[PDB]
Design a protein around this ligand. Structure first.
Ligand SMILES: *[C@@](C)(CO)[C@](*)(O)[C@H](CC(C)C)NC(=O)[C@H](Cc1ccccc1)NC(=O)[C@H](CC(C)C)NC(=O)[C@H](CCc1ccccc1)NC(=O)CN1CCOCC1
Ligand SMILES: [Mg+2]
Lengths: 212, 230, 244, 195, 235, 222, 240, 231
């Protein structure tokens, strides 16, 4: 996997690849690695597929029960802590997860929490998670500014996944984009790396290592 | 977690036009030591089912007790215990298969390979296998241990698919089984000459043959063999 | 079944009272009177033994006054056997606190926990409550000298001077009369004895029918001492105040 | 997690804690605060196994805060340190022990004295003028042995602390992304923003 | 005394029959089912004027497609609602779908008889459970502490129930619009209520396929009260 | 030491069309280098127009199918005979598998049927419960042989329109039941040639609105 | 374990054990809660048959559940400690998991739920206690005042009283409290609270306790002299 | 009188009054009929409503593809006992690959009901059941009573005014027993049987409830417009 999410002037960008592997066997190219928890909350998935899938789906059930009981949408901090406290109970049992809980609320504003299977929980502006996280960091960090436009931010997120998809053998398939605003999350399409790589190469003039 | 101590070797079987045949030798091995010679490894359940068991003998004797108790339990409050509500081969198998899988799932298996042979109430032939892992399968011929490697090839020459079953008589079928038992005596180091054989027919019923022996053996050619090369 | 024989110890009356707690208090009102008086420089505990026999061994005896730790003591009124169950619990609780925090337990914390145990027997379990009322006398570095009382209901309150057991109505009136805030220990000793002497059901108050204890800072420099009075020491203090 | 330091001076306790959070070959964060306020005049820094550290720190924080509400009173640093030690001492013989090392810096208002306690994951407690956990001690202890005096001011203590961080930044293999410094004194807990 | 799970000579459970008397003392709740939706309305009944009436929560959401109104010992309903919400969400987790209104009601009614010598007594509260699903459409259920539930086209529970039920018998037909049903609940509530009906002492709610379960504002209900008074004076 | 797992070989294949869905699987059952059965079915009609196969360790496969079949039965009892949708079945199976996360069912599970819009559906699971809807999936011993062939022939991967300079892709379209069965039969004959654990017989289960049909074909027995 | 069902229905549909618990509340000392425009005030009666008391150490009638919420009560004192302890633990547990202090409504809902559980659990009797819970939600300046009772029902109040002679002081508050214009300041709110207690108490000496709660965890208890000034002022205006 | 406080107490004449009071709850329940031939077995049940605005309480419950029952009395108790039967039928299938005999089904219900009549704290079940089924020995009809007593019959009826239908079936015994290979005629006989228990009310389309099981017929229930044929 390669997944990222960063905070900026216009909210939160979230971008992920869609590959799934079993060793060197490419098992799927069309995996949904973003889970839609509610209209204002997103969760990213890296590590063991089922662990992430199962428990983030379960997280959505716990968030629904919160707003039924409390008559109010759950905070990003509280949502992330439900997941982190859960995996901490299983610490040592062998769960494998690298997740990011992204969302907007009134009291918090745009917020991103990193949560992993050894119990780590971190608030932050930029995170890249997965086997190709370092490749995504390289492009993202060197081009990141807080004052990026919504258009430029969407592209940088897309371009960072593409960078990792190219170099990391265990990342690829297609890019899934999301933009999180004060009004909620907005889906910005599925982008196949097959067509996207050549389109980006031609238009941007990058990827000169590759035979054109 | 177990290790098998006193063990029983191959159990072999096949279907024929009117029923099923099953066989197994009377040996209880203690490693390389051929310890016990009067061991019966075919256990009839009613007049329509025979259960053949290989592997650990202590676990075989436990299974005997379970089947014995199953007959008793089925007879309770059952006026049709010797008629419509008698124990079928399929009932006896599914019970054993359930037990075997539950025991493997508790990491404490019954160290056996089992073949349930019999005839159903509607006349249909029943022959199915189950082992310590809870793995189950059915076939026109079935065999355990060395039987799987040596008997099945010979028995499949008689009944290769389903359509060959009506074409196979009890005389032809028993001949193949007895032949397979001879081959196993030549080649299996933990086998014996003495064995038991059981036939379950839809017409003539259950015939249980004890104290059979492997015979008509070819050993004469051994006298001509000298040295290992020169 | 067994429903037939259940007394239902933990229920309310139509008036909103707990039957068993009320009857336990009625039991305690027949027990020997115990008095606690708190002074500025110490605390006095005085208690009357229940009708003594001349062949009772007086010096090697303990009925009313018990030591919980080096800084806290209690005066008992009610069933002695019940009190000892609670006392051993309180003693253990004090040592748990010391083991955990490396500090002697604050008086109120010990009192609250003991009172919480009593409360439990009135709300659940279907058992009879403990027929005991305590006077806690103790010191800690937060509030200094402190007097508390607890009863079978599990309710506790703080006091400057207080009595439990028999004749508390008469005893409390006398304490309310002669008590003042700038009082010393030696004066409080005299008040405690004078009050028992007037409220007693006996003919005359004597050394053999009393238990007495002080908690002073009368040791050497900034430390507290517990004195459980010997028979001869009670005989002398009774002569010194002119009661005998 | 990695670097946590502590220095007790005349009138205060100063705790310094590294900002880096590293996993694998990536520094995930460079602004992490490895401390929790247990009470107005008691601060605990921590370091060790991932997940365990924060889970343990917050669990202790909750218990001390519960005590404060119940008694309407602040526990002494000594009392808090003993409570913490016992919890770790229980933990070490559990099915899965907390692998967390802590420093507890506090100001005792009754004694009017600063106090620094060092407790490892086994439940080994010591009161010290200066303390450290992990590989940090191998550089800082010898340095403080030389330069430390018991009558130093808070400003003198911060300069002494700058000397420790400089040495670590010179000789430590890993980039720990500087430190967050906090002071504990008679007026409570405050953070130094420019270090 | 006597056992909690004892039968009377007539063949009824004493404790269940006594809990039904407690429900008759409770405040009135009415529900009406239409092809356009299901309406739920309740009498708040504040014990004193100083009590802030908006904190009286006798209509409750279970899921987006299921709502609930109560009557009787309303404190007893909290654990019933908690169970219902968990049942609804748990089913969505196991089957990736909304749960049938009937199945939800059956799950709640399974708690009912789990008492004896499990909890110490039956629930002293009745529930009206309204909802929608793809199979059986708009539904209204009446869940009792006996463990029994009936589906209803319309139903009233509480102190003014027998009087309100007789009125619902005459007024209900299969072609009622949602607006007609809203007014009908207000009309019948105003009849059986002690104090004069207004937006502060009564509360409306509905569940529709499109918008799901919604509790109405005091402003929205106030207009429906004004519309109701005008229509009765118009003939 | 006792090893609770085993490998029974075989391979399975699911393809979805516009108004239908097929779930195929060979009938061979093996252990090590021996054949146990030439005809032992592992594709099952589970009711509600849902076909299922759990390939790998047969004892775990049978256990799972048995539990899901039973899950369907209790779904009817508890929810007024409601039809279990394919998407609901998929989620239910995830919980069955994950329930043994720390002692897993050693199987690749595939189910097939029609979605609630009447369109063909295929879901596939890993051994511990992760799942995904797809047009196409091969599972089991010969999955690595068959799957890339399906990418090329079902989803027209790496195929471009002739003469368009590799700019225009070959357009996606649904395949007829006839065309799909051709691909299935060819996939299994190819797999039989190059994989030793695959052979003996092929059994296909086709699922339309009218019900569940079966087709059987012979495969090489070596 | 002791299993007996103590709280059960009667032929007329009443749970007598719950109703007898309300009688215990009626016996308890009076407690009053009044919320103003920017504050809440909790007033409490203390009976004067107990002289020679030590007020330093004696348990106070108003208890802090967290730094922003307080709880007063009427009824059995020993029972109240059990509810207060549970509430305090739940307050810290909420901060731990939700990373935010409890709302006053949530804390009330929890305490009320505990009280309810004791009305249909075997082997236990109901709590002989009714509570007044007051405070301010995190990052909020709207005053909150809730009431609970043994049955388990809870509700919000502009102003409310519980305990002995509570029906007299509730009568006073019902005509003296204006919904359209609540006590604008702290002084106005405290005065109305003291006035209401003076209808029932006896003497305004060491019989009245007052606790003021303001936004952002600002809670303070008034001393004798401070309260006595309100008593002195009210009596002089009364003689008219 | 003094001996009806709980189920654990015998009366001086040897009666269990709590068991008898549970039996009384069945008599108050709505009528339901059971009958069988050699090929099929039929349940007919009169459903009851709260009022005209309410639904009609469902009386028949499916236990397996080859077995099910009708109820009369406390419906929740029928739900508990039917759920137990569903599990027992299911255990027999999963473990033994064997359809549970209807006779064994009765023995299991008997033993479950009995335990509740010999222990302190518990109570008897307050419902009577008619179990029909088709197994390896043909069609069957059982009558369950919460005392524990289970009885196999050709036909029967339980509930209020059940004596009318029970007398009719006793007369019609020789006729309906030989209705083999004809479902509709066996139902007609069952519908005519339950009609002998009606007073002031007649069988309507949302009032009647029929269920059938047989040789080539799984246990199925008919309600609504599907029973209009039999009115
Ligand atoms: C990038 C793409 C790679 O790291 C991402 O991290 C993705 C995250 C997405 C999918 C959410 N991760 C994977 O693709 C992940 C990598 C991985 C594998 C195993 C353990 C940890 C991480 N892959 C999986 O989880 C695959 C997904 C399948 C192919 C749909 N699943 C498996 O490998 C499963 C289950 C692994 C497992 C975990 C815990 C306990 C037991 C098993 N294993 C198999 O399917 C076994 N194998 C398949 C091939 O045939 C032989 C049997
Ligand atoms: Mg790559």
């Amino acid at each position: 996997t390669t997944t990222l999410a960063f905070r900026f002037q216009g909210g939160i960008i979230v971008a992920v690849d869609s590959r799934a592997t079993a060793g060197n066997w490419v098992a799927s190219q069309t995996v949904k690695k973003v889970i839609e928890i509610n209209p204002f909350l997103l969760g990213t998935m890296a590590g063991g597929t089922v662990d992430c899938q199962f428990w983030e789906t379960w997280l959505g059930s716990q968030c629904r029960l919160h707003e039924l009981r409390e008559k109010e949408r759950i905070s990003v901090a509280a949502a992330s802590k439900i997941l982190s406290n859960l995996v901490y109970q299983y610490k040592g049992a062998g769960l494998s997860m690298g997740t990011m809980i992204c969302g907007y609320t009134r009291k918090e504003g745009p917020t991103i929490y990193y949560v992993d299977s050894d119990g780590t929980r971190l608030k932050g502006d930029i995170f890249c998670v997965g086997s190709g996280q370092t490749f995504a960091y390289g492009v993202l960090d060197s081009n990141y500014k807080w004052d990026l436009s919504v258009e430029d931010a969407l592209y940088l997120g897309k371009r960072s996944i593409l960078a990792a998809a190219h170099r990391d053998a265990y990342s690829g398939g297609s890019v899934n984009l999301y933009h999180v605003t004060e009004d909620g999350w907005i889906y910005h399409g599925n982008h196949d790396v097959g067509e996207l790589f050549w389109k980006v190469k031609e238009e941007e003039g990058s990827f000169n290592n590759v035979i054109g | 977690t177990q290790q098998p101590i006193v063990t029983g070797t191959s159990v072999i079987s096949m279907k024929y036009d009117n029923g099923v045949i099953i066989a197994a030798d009377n040996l209880g091995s203690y490693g390389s030591l051929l310890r016990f010679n009067g061991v019966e490894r075919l256990i009839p359940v009613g007049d329509n089912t025979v259960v053949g068991i290989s592997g650990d003998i202590s676990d075989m004797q436990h299974i005997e007790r379970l089947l014995k108790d199953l007959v008793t339990e089925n007879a309770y409050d059952n006026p049709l215990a010797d008629a419509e509500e008698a124990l079928e081969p399929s009932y006896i198998f599914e019970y054993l298969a359930t037990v075997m899988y539950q025991r493997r799932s508790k990491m404490n298996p019954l160290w056996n390979a089992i073949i349930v042979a019999g005839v159903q109430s509607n006349g249909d032939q029943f022959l199915r296998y189950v082992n310590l892992l809870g793995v189950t399968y059915s076939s026109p011929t079935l065999a355990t241990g060395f039987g799987a490697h040596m008997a099945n090839p010979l028995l499949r020459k008689v009944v290769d698919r389903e359509s060959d079953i009506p074409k196979t008589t009890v005389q032809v079928a028993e001949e193949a089984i007895v032949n397979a038992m001879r081959v196993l005596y030549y080649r299996d180091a933990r086998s014996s000459r003495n064995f038991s054989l059981a036939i379950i027919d839809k017409n003539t019923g259950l015939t249980f043959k004890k104290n059979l022996q492997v015979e008509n053996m070819k050993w004469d050619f051994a006298k001509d063999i000298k040295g290992y090369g020169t | 079944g067994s429903r037939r024989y259940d007394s239902r110890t933990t229920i309310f009356s139509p008036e909103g009272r707990l039957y068993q707690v009320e009857y336990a208090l009625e039991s305690i009102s027949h027990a020997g009177t115990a008095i606690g008086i708190m002074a500025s420089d110490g605390i006095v505990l005085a208690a009357e033994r229940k009708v003594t026999s001349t062949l009772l061994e007086q010096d090697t005896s303990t009925e009313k006054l018990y030591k919980l730790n080096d800084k806290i003591a209690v005066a008992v009124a009610g069933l002695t056997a019940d009190a000892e169950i609670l006392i051993n619990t309180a003693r253990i609780h004090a040592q748990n606190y010391l083991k955990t925090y490396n500090e002697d337990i604050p008086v109120e914390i010990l009192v609250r926990r003991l009172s919480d145990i009593k409360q439990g027997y009135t709300q659940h379990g279907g058992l009879r409550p403990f027929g005991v009322s305590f006077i806690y006398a103790g010191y800690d570095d937060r509030y200094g000298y402190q007097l508390y009382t607890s009863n079978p209901s599990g309710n506790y309150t703080g006091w400057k001077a207080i009595s439990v057991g028999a004749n508390t109505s008469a005893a409390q009136t006398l304490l309310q009369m002669d008590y003042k805030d700038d009082m010393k220990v030696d004066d409080a000793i005299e008040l405690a004895l004078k009050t028992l002497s007037k409220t007693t059901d006996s003919s005359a108050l004597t050394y053999d029918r009393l238990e007495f204890a002080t908690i002073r800072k009368g040791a050497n420099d900034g430390e507290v001492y517990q004195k459980i009075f010997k028979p001869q020491e009670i005989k002398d203090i009774l002569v010194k105040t002119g009661i005998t | 997690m990695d670097i946590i330091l502590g220095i007790r001076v005349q009138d205060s306790v100063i705790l310094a804690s590294s900002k880096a959070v590293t996993r694998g070959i990536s520094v995930l964060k460079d602004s992490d605060d490895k401390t929790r306020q247990l009470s107005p005049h008691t601060l605990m820094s921590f370091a060790g196994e991932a997940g365990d550290t924060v889970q343990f720190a917050e669990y202790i924080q909750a218990n001390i805060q519960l005590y404060s509400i119940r008694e309407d009173y602040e526990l002494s640093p000594q009392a808090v340190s003993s409570f913490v030690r016992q919890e770790l001492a229980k933990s070490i013989r559990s099915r899965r022990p907390y692998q967390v090392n802590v420093l507890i810096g506090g100001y005792d208002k009754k004694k009017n004295k600063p106090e620094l306690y060092q407790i490892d994951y086994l439940g080994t407690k010591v009161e010290l003028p200066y303390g450290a956990h992990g590989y940090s001690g191998f550089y800082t202890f010898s340095l403080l042995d030389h330069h430390y005096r018991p009558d130093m001011t808070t400003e003198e203590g911060l300069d002494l602390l700058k000397l420790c961080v400089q040495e670590l930044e010179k000789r430590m293999p890993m980039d720990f992304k500087g430190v967050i410094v906090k002071i504990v004194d008679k007026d409570g807990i405050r953070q130094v923003d420019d270090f | 005394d006597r056992g909690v799970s004892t039968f009377s000579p007539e063949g009824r459970l004493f404790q269940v029959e006594y809990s039904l008397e407690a429900i008759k003392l409770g405040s009135t709740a009415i529900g009406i089912a239409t092809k356009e939706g299901v309406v739920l309305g309740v009498e708040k009944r504040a014990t004193s004027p100083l009590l802030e009436s908006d904190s009286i929560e006798k209509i409750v959401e279970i899921d987006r497609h299921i709502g609930c109104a109560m009557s009787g010992l309303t404190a007893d309903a909290r654990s019933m609602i908690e169970h219902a919400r968990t049942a609804a969400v748990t089913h969505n987790l196991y089957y990736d779908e909304d749960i049938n209104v009937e199945s939800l009601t059956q799950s709640v009614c399974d708690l009912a008889l789990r008492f004896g010598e499990l909890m110490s007594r039956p629930f002293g509260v009745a529930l009206l459970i309204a909802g929608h699903d793809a199979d059986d459409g708009y539904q209204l259920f009446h869940a009792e502490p006996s463990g029994t539930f009936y589906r209803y086209n319309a139903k009233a529970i509480g102190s003014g129930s027998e009087g309100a039920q007789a009125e619902l018998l005459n007024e209900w037909h299969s072609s009622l619009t949602l607006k007609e049903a809203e007014l009908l609940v207000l009309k019948i509530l105003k009849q059986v209520m002690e104090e004069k009906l207004d937006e502060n002492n009564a509360q409306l709610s509905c569940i529709t396929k499109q918008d799901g379960f919604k509790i109405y504002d005091n402003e929205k209900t106030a207009e429906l009260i004004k519309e109701l008074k005008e229509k009765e004076a118009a003939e | 030491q006792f090893n609770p797992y085993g490998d029974n070989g075989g391979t399975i294949l699911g393809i979805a069309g516009e108004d239908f869905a097929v779930l195929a699987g060979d009938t061979r059952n093996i252990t090590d280098y021996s054949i146990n059965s030439r005809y032992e079915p592992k594709v099952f009609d589970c009711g509600d127009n849902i076909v299922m196969s759990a390939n790998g360790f047969a004892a775990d496969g049978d256990a799972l199918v048995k539990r899901f079949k039973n899950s369907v039965k209790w779904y009817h009892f508890d929810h007024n005979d409601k039809k279990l949708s394919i998407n609901s079945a998929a989620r239910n199976i995830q919980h069955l598998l994950y329930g043994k996360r720390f002692f897993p069912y050693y199987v690749h599970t595939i189910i097939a049927g029609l979605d609630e819009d009447g369109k063909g559906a295929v879901y596939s699971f890993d051994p511990v419960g992760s799942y995904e809807r797809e047009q196409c999936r091969a599972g089991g011993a010969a999955a690595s042989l068959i799957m890339p062939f399906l990418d090329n022939q079902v989803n027209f991967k790496n195929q471009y329109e002739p003469g368009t300079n590799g700019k225009v892709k070959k357009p996606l379209k649904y395949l007829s039941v006839e065309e799909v069965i051709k691909l299935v039969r060819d996939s299994f004959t190819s797999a039989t040639e190059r994989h030793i654990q695959v052979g003996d017989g092929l059994e296909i289960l086709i699922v339309t609105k009218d019900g569940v049909r079966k087709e059987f074909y012979e495969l090489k027995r070596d | 374990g002791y299993d007996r069902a103590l709280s059960i229905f009667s032929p007329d549909g009443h749970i007598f054990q719950v109703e007898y618990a309300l009688e215990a509340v009626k016996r308890g000392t009076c407690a009053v809660g009044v919320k103003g425009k920017n504050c809440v005030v909790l007033g409490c009666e203390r009976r004067s048959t107990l002289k020679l008391q030590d007020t330093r150490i004696t348990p106070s009638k108003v208890s802090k559940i967290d730094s922003h919420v307080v709880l007063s009560f009427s009824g059995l004192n020993a029972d109240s400690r059990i509810l207060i302890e549970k509430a305090r633990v739940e307050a810290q547990s909420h901060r731990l998991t939700l990373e935010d202090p409890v709302t006053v409504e949530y804390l009330t809902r929890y305490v009320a739920g505990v009280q309810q559980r004791y009305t249909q659990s075997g082997g236990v009797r109901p709590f002989g206690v009714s509570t007044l819970i007051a405070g301010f939600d995190p990052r909020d300046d709207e005053p909150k005042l809730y009431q609970t009772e043994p049955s388990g029902i809870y509700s919000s109040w502009s102003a409310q009283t519980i305990g002995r002679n509570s029906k007299t002081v509730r009568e006073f508050l019902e005509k003296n409290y204006d919904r359209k214009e609540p006590p604008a300041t702290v002084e106005e709110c405290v005065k109305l609270t003291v006035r209401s207690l003076l209808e029932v108490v006896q003497t305004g000496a060491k019989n009245i306790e007052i606790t003021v709660v303001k936004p952002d965890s600002d809670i303070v208890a008034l001393s004798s002299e401070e309260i006595n000034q309100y008593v002195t002022q009210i009596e002089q205006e009364k003689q008219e | 009188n003094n001996y009806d406080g709980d189920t654990v107490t015998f009366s001086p004449t040897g009666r269990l009054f709590q068991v008898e009071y549970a039996l009384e709850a069945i008599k108050q329940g709505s009528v339901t009929v059971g009958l069988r031939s050699n090929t099929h077995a039929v349940l007919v049940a009169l459903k009851r409503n709260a009022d005209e605005l309410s639904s009609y309480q469902k009386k028949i419950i499916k236990c397996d593809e080859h077995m099910g029952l009708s109820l009369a009395g406390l419906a929740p108790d029928a739900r508990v006992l039917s759920n137990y039967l569903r599990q027992q039928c299911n255990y027999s299938s999963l473990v033994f690959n064997r359809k549970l005999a209807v006779e064994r089904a009765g023995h299991l219900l008997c033993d479950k009901a009995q335990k509740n009549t010999q222990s302190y704290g518990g109570r008897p079940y307050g419902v009577g059941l008619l179990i029909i089924g088709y197994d390896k020995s043909g069609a069957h009809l059982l009558e369950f009573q919460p005392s524990g007593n289970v009885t196999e019959l050709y036909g029967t009826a339980i509930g209020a005014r059940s004596q009318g239908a029970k007398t009719y079936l006793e007369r019609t015994l020789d006729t309906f027993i030989k209705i083999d290979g004809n479902p509709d005629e066996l139902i007609k006989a069952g519908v005519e049987a339950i009609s002998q228990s009606l007073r002031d009310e007649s069988l309507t389309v949302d009032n009647l409830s029929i269920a059938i099981v047989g040789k080539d017929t799984p246990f199925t229930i008919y309600d609504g417009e599907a029973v209009a044929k039999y009115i």
